[PDB]
Amino acid sequence: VVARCKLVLVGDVQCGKTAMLQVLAKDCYPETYVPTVFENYTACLETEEQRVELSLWDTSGSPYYDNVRPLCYSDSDAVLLCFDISRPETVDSALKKWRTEILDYCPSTRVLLIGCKTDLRTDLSTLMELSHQKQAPISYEQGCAIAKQLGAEIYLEGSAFTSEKSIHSIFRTASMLCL
Ligand SMILES: Nc1nc2c(ncn2[C@@H]2O[C@H](COP(=O)(O)OP(=O)(O)OP(=O)(O)O)[C@@H](O)[C@H]2O)c(=O)[nH]1
Ligand SMILES: [Mg+2]
């Protein structure tokens, strides 16, 4: 049985949503930022004991689209709440805003927390730039703690830029959780 699964990604502008989808579905990384309006992707993968067909909905992180974004939440198997690990702020109150929008659509919808750009954890520009904000990249441990406080089923993370296998792994796990 080829199982079918609808996943929606949401999160702040530039947090890494499209980069993940392009890697997963097109084996393509976009080094230059092009803001998303809306896009759909299709990916097939094997998830443990199943072939799964993923229907993936890419949304804009911009508040300009707040009135129209919830329309893609219908009949979703999970919403992937994404954040940039290098920006303890796409996390901060913003993941609360994001979590509430998903709750306000339907409290029954499953939420997975996805950390993006994990390669920036050891990047020296990121480290210093954040240090004089008295901050540091989000660690794996912090990701898990955030997932708990946002009622996400799991924290998963990757790097679209340096590890395509980290991305395929996120979506394999996401699919098993929805099956
Ligand atoms: N260092 C690093 N940069 C990344 C990674 N993934 C994406 N980026 C960078 O961040 C930019 C923004 O990524 P996107 O995927 O386009 O951002 P987005 O979440 O889709 O943003 P919106 O469409 O505006 O909501 C990319 O063009 C890359 O320059 C990553 O894994 N590591
Ligand atoms: Mg995008």
Curated annotation (Swiss-Prot):
One of its GO terms (cellular component) is plasma membrane. GO terms for molecular function: GTP binding; GTPase activity; protein kinase binding; signaling receptor binding. Signal peptide: none annotated. It is found in: Cell membrane; Cytoplasm, Cytoskeleton. Its main location: membrane. Changing residue 18 to N: Impairs interaction with UBXD5. A motif (Effector region) lies at residues 33-41. GTP binds at residues 14-19, 29-36, 58-62, 116-119, 160-161. GO terms for biological process: actin filament organization; negative regulation of cell adhesion; neuron remodeling; regulation of actin cytoskeleton organization; signal transduction; small GTPase-mediated signal transduction. Mostly expressed in brain and liver. It is a lipid-anchor. Changing residue 36 to A: Abolishes interaction with UBXD5. Keywords: Cell membrane, Cytoplasm, Cytoskeleton, GTP-binding, Lipoprotein, Membrane, Methylation, Nucleotide-binding, Prenylation. Belongs to the small GTPase superfamily. Rho family. Lacks intrinsic GTPase activity. Has a low affinity for GDP, and constitutively binds GTP. Controls rearrangements of the actin cytoskeleton. Induces the Rac-dependent neuritic process formation in part by disruption of the cortical actin filaments. Causes the formation of many neuritic processes from the cell body with disruption of the cortical actin filaments. Binds GRB7 and PLXNB1. Interacts with UBXD5. Interacts with PLXNA2. This is Rho-related GTP-binding protein Rho6. The gene is RND1. The chain holds residues 10 to 188 of 232 of the full protein.
